[PDB]
Design a protein around this nucleic acid. Structure first.
Lengths: 193, 130, 106, 204, 251, 173
RNA sequence: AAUGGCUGAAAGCCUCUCAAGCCAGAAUUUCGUCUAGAUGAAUACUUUGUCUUUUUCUUGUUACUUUAGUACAAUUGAAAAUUAUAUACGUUGUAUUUAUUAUCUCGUGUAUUACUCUAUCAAAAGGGUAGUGAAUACUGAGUUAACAAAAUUUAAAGCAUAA
RNA sequence: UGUCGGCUCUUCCUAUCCAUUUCAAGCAGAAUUGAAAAAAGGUAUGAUUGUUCACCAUUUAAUAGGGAACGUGAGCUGGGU
RNA sequence: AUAAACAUACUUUGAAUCGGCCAAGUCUGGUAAGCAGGACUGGCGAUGCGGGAUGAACCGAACGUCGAGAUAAAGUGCCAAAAAGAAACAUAACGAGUACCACAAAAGGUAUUCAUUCAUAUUGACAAUAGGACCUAUCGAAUGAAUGAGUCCUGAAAAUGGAUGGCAUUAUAAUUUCUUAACUGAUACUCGACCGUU
């Protein structure tokens, strides 16, 4: 039903400064600065000081409030309150998505650019084609070891998407997927710290 | 953060109706569209009645310590304790309502002098700046 | 020199969906927006002052008129009905009329 | 009288079907309309569903000779002239004398850049919409169906905000100095006789 | 019903309507996309076709089965005497396409270029480009030229040179020159005009426009065949011999 | 909508002439109220108008139409499936006002016209006995919300103009 | 597009979203290129410098010719953006047509201008500089009006010469 | 209202035969099978019969099904009726 | 009880006609038909006008020539004369929009709104994390199951390009209900003038 007021809030640790200008949030932290645009015309984001713990003092928070509205549009407060939580975590403890390579018989060789801004996959299932797969902005690919890479970055929406672009370029076509279980997969997703 | 909320005790300005441009005090919120304005009938003249939120306009004054369903005998004290009438007449809309009343009483001789005087003063202002 | 009229638009004749009665002409007086402000204008003279180019060898004037009155309101938007001595030409639809201030009652 | 002036309608953030019904009624009332920025107008529906509504409008075309069939004009200047032309009398003299008093320009040409722009309260998108309902700028849709002149209008506009913002700065310094001087002569002793007349009616 | 056996339609619908042109020269309706990071260069020419002849060409390709001796190929000899640049014109992108802003012209104009502005030269007083030439050096008419250049450098995006052939070097009986606007593609508009102004009255040769082993997009007007039936024009199947009222038509 | 107090008695062999049938009927006028009352006797007590007499028919004005009360309405309506019973809660200052809401919402949510609903009983309930998910949020003492995305309110129809000057903005209100 | 996905609520977990925001993906759609194409633009030469109508010359057009009539420079018309809009105020409550104190005469200087004109630098600018005139504020004083008149916005005749 | 079929020609529908992009299998490969986006392209040569239909011999990636007065006679042919 | 004096009862002579068709809170044969055949009544035929965009039958209403007014069916974003306010269920779609009328079904949905019944709900109910289906700790307010009624989505494929009438709308200019002694409108109603019949 139509909630009179749906509220959410995210805590700001001591190392990050957040400034809002008409739902254009800019988050600054030790690893850098991140900016996003939350173009929902029915919510207001304003920083405030609210007591979060039951028996604690006031803490700097970002409060997202959506007033009278149906359950279709009231679901976005927690989505907005969680995209911000990934901009505070990202600039404080950066993201990292370790990625493995699985092959049956044909070895796969990955070529990483000098700056790490791009990758290159060769000899996938013996195919002579050489897929490139360029990364997004602010995402760096490095080779952890043998048959393993990890994508360092600050924006989860760009690190993870760049991690899903490598797997989408190494699919097996016209063959039984249940047996030709090759490609590159996301082993685990963690933080740099 | 929103400054002016629709609560109990908020002083609202009835824009449309026979009581247009009169002060009313909310003493109940029936639902999201209807409130119970009781801008004390012995002070402003707005009787207690259910009105829509599409007729009233909010003002930045909240009468202090007003509970829902206040009587007329006790609401009149709080309204006159904070002197909303004194404070309302100093705001931008308070000076707009009194301006509308004066220009209504203007005759044709009074409309002729003001136009013939404003133009002289306005032109003299433009001369004074180089 | 001076203005002593408010320009009312000749909207058309009092009609139906598939009819037209040219005996009564509707006007949208400038500044009137409701039927409650029409009680003033019921009676004030209205003239359809138009201009005709004429040759120098003729006597008829180059500026003529068709005078009429305002007889009743029409609709809730302040549209009025005007009855003229000679029904206005359908070439004046959309043009501007004159709404005088006499016979005054002020 | 003779209403020869032009009522310029600034179509930023209006609705295509409501800014054209007010114009269509008022064109027949002997008025001249110039709708500047017929490309920022709004239509309900996402971009995906505003192309199905256009693919449907692209099918209607005379089979035996498409060069006779419905000419589907893409330029948003002509997507509002067609919308108005639908609500005007069809195939008579009154429906054309009132259609010569209508213009759209996607940008803002020279003589209409410096005119007193108007607005239509009944056609605004803030008064007649649920703010979550998804709209579509006419310019945004026009490019998707093959409008080749969308970068030009943006570039021309970008050079109109930088020439009207620097005019405002010079205008507001003179307007503030004039207002500050008018207060000085309001308090003048020589003008006390006249001020009491203005002050009586709330003009000072 | 349905046609018994399906076939590919005869003729092309991308060329309908088939209206014959008027001017012999075929205007080039599009020029290569402008690249702003190179030295300005002409992007076209204009030559008179002469004929065809066959050559024996040595194959320089790899992994091909063509004989090592040679491959017999047909070639076309297009005679292109050097053209003369006689001004330039600057275009501007508006909401209705390009709009020619101005046009600066050289001083000395050959008699093969003046003829294009008349329809009967033997009776014409031949006063074309006379007032322009006689007042070329006047200070009043020199500031106007310098004004036109500053207009193009500021409010223009495309610069083209109005180059015309020389008809005394070709065996054609025609005398009036053929005028072409050859776009300049290269650096910013500041240096396009400076390149266009440097070319005035100066002959341009084909090797300064094209290069060796370069592919080009020739544009021309085809051969004239007059009224033609349905068999020649579109290619439909000729009807059986028994047919009444003739064979070579659509049924 | 109005509320009427109607009483009548039956005078024939089947019914004794000492039983009075009271009623509190809701109808737009007093002739649609008698019609509701007469058919309520005939379908329940086998009394026909020809064999009965109307004794009293008076309106029932609200005593205190300045106080907000939570009204509870028990009603039965007929759907394409069968016959159901509903119990909706409404907030209004008059009994004749809270019933008018009942006809509008029933004729909108359930798409049942007004000649299918039989109002059985309307009473007043307490603050905490409001089961409606939306009505429950406004019965508290400390309810406050900002009326946002407003639209400017004109004094009357006189000042409304077809075409305006300048840009139009809403109000934080 | 079908489909596979990313972050992600609803619903503390889960989910590609009958949620907001995005990526990959057709012989697909749209630019690009090809053909026909209407209103247009620039330049060259002839003119015209407020004006059209009717007769009239030419294969036809423009300029041209005659007798007329008509006004004579000078106060109009722009902030942008958002609408859950930084905070404050809600600045209320009539868009164009339709915001000048009847006309004329005599008076001192200053100051002003999206005002007129000239010269110049520039310019596809409500541009800069200099000068002049107009209006306006300081701000006047005086004459006249009584009866009639305050409508141009277009008519009628020609072919000497030039392109 | 010239009443079967064929030759010629154009267009339209998708309830898709091939080519393009995807899911499912009792999909290990090859072959095949079920379904989704999609009508911009293509869909044959012959023996017998007047035949539409039919049955055979080949070929191709496929030789899919239909409408337009049972499309089409001042377009033809006149095999049948 | 009510109506009835241009009432009532007729007499003589005679013309046209006996191919009918439509509607339905009706029926029979038929799978069904814009099919065939009937009972009571009204119409089209024989009939215009205002409305349903167009329509022989549907709704209003039947006509000498007019003028002024209130009306009927039905409507009041523009074409089009005329309406503003209030509330809700829809609308991320060629979904919705004037009956007769020019179509859509069975079925499915953890889509949505309302209502009913039952159960667990406290200092501890679910989900989650940690430890050993079940228990503890943290987490602290509603949660879970079933049924009924609306709205919506799939079900939903045909041949020239096209039809809520078009444009167009999307906290509507849609659907359902309402408020204001609001408005628009026929050749019908009232008043007045004129022609004719009795």
């Amino acid at each position: 039903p139509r909630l009179l007021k749906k509220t959410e809030h995210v805590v700001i640790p001591e190392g990050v400064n957040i400034e809002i200008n008409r739902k254009n949030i800019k988050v600054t932290g030790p690893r850098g600065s991140l900016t996003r645009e939350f173009q929902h015309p029915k919510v207001d984001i304003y920083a405030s000081k609210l007591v979060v713990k039951k028996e604690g003092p006031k803490e700097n928070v970002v409060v997202i409030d959506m007033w009278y509205g149906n359950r279709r549009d009231s679901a976005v407060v927690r989505t907005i309150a969680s995209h911000i939580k990934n901009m505070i975590t990202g600039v404080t403890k950066g993201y990292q998505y370790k990625m493995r390579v699985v092959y049956a018989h044909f070895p796969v060789t990955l070529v990483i650019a000098d700056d790490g801004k791009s990758i290159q996959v060769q000899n996938f299932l013996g195919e002579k084609r050489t897929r490139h797969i360029e990364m997004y902005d602010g995402v760096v690919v490095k080779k952890l070891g043998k048959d393993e890479i990890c994508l360092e970055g600050n924006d989860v929406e760009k690190v993870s998407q760049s991690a899903a672009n490598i797997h989408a370029a190494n699919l097996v076509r016209n063959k039984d997927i249940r047996q030709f279980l090759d490609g590159v997969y996301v082993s685990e997703k963690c933080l740099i710290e | 953060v929103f400054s002016r909320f629709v609560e109990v005790g908020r002083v609202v300005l009835m824009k449309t109706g026979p009581f247009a441009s009169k002060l009313a005090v909310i003493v109940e919120i029936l639902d999201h569209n209807r409130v119970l304005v009781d801008g004390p009938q012995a002070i402003t003249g707005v009787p207690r009645q259910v009105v829509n939120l599409n007729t009233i306009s909010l003002t930045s004054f909240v009468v202090n310590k007003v509970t829902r369903g206040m009587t007329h005998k006790k609401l009149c004290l709080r309204f006159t304790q904070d002197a909303i009438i004194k404070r309302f007449n100093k705001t931008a809309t308070g000076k707009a309502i009194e301006k509308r009343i004066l220009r209504e009483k203007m005759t044709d001789f009074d409309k002729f002098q003001v136009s013939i005087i404003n133009r002289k003063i306005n032109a003299a202002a433009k001369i004074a700046v180089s | 020199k001076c203005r002593l009229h408010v320009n009312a638009v000749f909207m058309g004749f009092q009609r139906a969906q598939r009819n037209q009665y040219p005996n009564v002409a509707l006007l949208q007086i400038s500044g009137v927006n409701t039927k409650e402000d029409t009680p003033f204008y019921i009676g004030k003279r209205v003239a359809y002052v138009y201009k005709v180019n004429v040759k120098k060898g003729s006597n008829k004037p180059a500026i003529r008129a068709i005078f009429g009155k305002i007889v009743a309101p029409h609709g809730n938007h302040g549209v009025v009905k005007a009855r003229f001595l000679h029904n206005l030409p359908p070439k004046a639809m959309g043009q501007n009329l004159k709404v005088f201030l006499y016979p005054s009652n002020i | 009288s003779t209403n020869n002036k032009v009522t310029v309608i600034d179509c930023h953030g209006h609705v295509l079907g409501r800014v054209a019904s007010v114009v269509a009624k008022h064109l027949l009332l002997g008025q001249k309309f110039v709708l500047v920025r017929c490309e920022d107008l709004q239509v309900c529906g996402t971009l995906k569903m505003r192309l199905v509504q256009w693919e449907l409008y692209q099918r209607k075309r005379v089979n035996t000779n498409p060069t006779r069939g419905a000419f589907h004009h893409r330029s948003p200047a002509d997507m509002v002239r067609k919308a108005v032309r639908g609500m005007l009398p069809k195939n008579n003299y009154r429906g054309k004398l009132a259609l010569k008093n209508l213009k759209c320009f996607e940008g803002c040409p020279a003589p209409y850049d410096k005119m007193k722009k108007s607005s239509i309260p009944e056609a605004a998108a803030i008064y007649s919409f649920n703010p979550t309902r998804k709209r579509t700028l006419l310019g945004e849709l026009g490019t998707a169906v093959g409008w080749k002149y969308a970068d030009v209008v943006a570039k021309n506009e970008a050079e109109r905000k930088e020439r009207a913002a620097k005019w405002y700065a010079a205008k507001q310094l003179k307007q503030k100095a004039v207002a500050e001087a008018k207060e000085k002569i309001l308090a003048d002793e020589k003008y006390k006789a006249k001020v009491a007349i203005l002050k009586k009616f709330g003009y000072a | 019903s349905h046609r018994k056996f399906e076939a590919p339609r005869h003729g092309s619908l991308a060329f309908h309507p088939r209206k014959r042109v008027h001017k012999v020269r075929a205007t080039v309706s599009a020029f290569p996309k402008d690249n702003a990071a190179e030295k300005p260069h002409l992007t076209g020419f204009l030559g008179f076709k002469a004929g065809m002849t066959h050559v024996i060409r040595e194959v320089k390709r790899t992994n091909t089965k063509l004989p090592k001796d040679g491959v017999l190929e047909p070639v076309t000899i297009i005679e292109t005497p050097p053209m003369v640049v006689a001004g330039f014109v600057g275009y501007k992108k508006t909401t209705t396409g390009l709009k020619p802003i101005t046009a600066v012209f050289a001083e000395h104009i050959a008699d093969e270029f003046k003829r294009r502005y008349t329809k009967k030269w033997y009776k014409n007083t031949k006063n074309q480009f006379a007032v322009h030439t006689e007042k070329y050096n006047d200070v009043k008419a020199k500031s106007k030229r310098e004004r036109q250049i500053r207009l193009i450098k500021n409010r223009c995006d495309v610069v083209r040179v109005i180059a015309h052939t020389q008809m005394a070097l070709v065996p054609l009986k025609q005398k009036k020159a053929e005028v072409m606007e050859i776009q300049i593609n290269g650096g910013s508009i500041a240096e396009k005009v400076d390149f266009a102004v440097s070319l005035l009255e100066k002959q341009i040769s084909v090797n300064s426009v094209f290069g060796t082993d370069e592919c080009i997009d020739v544009c021309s007007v085809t051969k004239g065949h007059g009224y033609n039936g349905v068999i020649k024009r579109f290619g439909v199947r000729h009807l059986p011999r028994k047919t009444h009222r003739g064979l070579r038509k659509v049924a | 909508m109005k509320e009427y107090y109607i009483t009548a008695r039956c005078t024939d062999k089947a019914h004794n002439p000492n039983e009075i049938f009271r009623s509190r009927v809701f109808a737009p006028n007093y002739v649609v109220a008698k019609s509701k009352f007469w058919m309520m006797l005939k379908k329940q007590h086998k009394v026909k108008k020809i064999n009965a007499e109307l004794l009293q028919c008076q309106p029932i004005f609200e005593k205190n139409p300045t106080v907000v009360k939570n009204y509870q309405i028990f009603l039965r309506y007929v759907s394409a499936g069968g016959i159901h019973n509903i119990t909706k809660q409404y907030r209004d200052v008059t009994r004749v006002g809270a019933v008018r809401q009942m006809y509008n919402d029933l004729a909108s949510q359930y798409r049942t016209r007004q000649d299918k609903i039989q109002l059985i009983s309307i009473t007043t309930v307490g603050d905490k006995a409001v089961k409606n998910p939306v009505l429950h949020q406004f019965v508290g003492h400390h309810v406050k919300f900002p009326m946002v995305h407003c639209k400017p309110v004109i004094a009357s129809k006189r000042f409304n103009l077809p075409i305006k000057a300048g840009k139009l903005t809403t109000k934080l209100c």
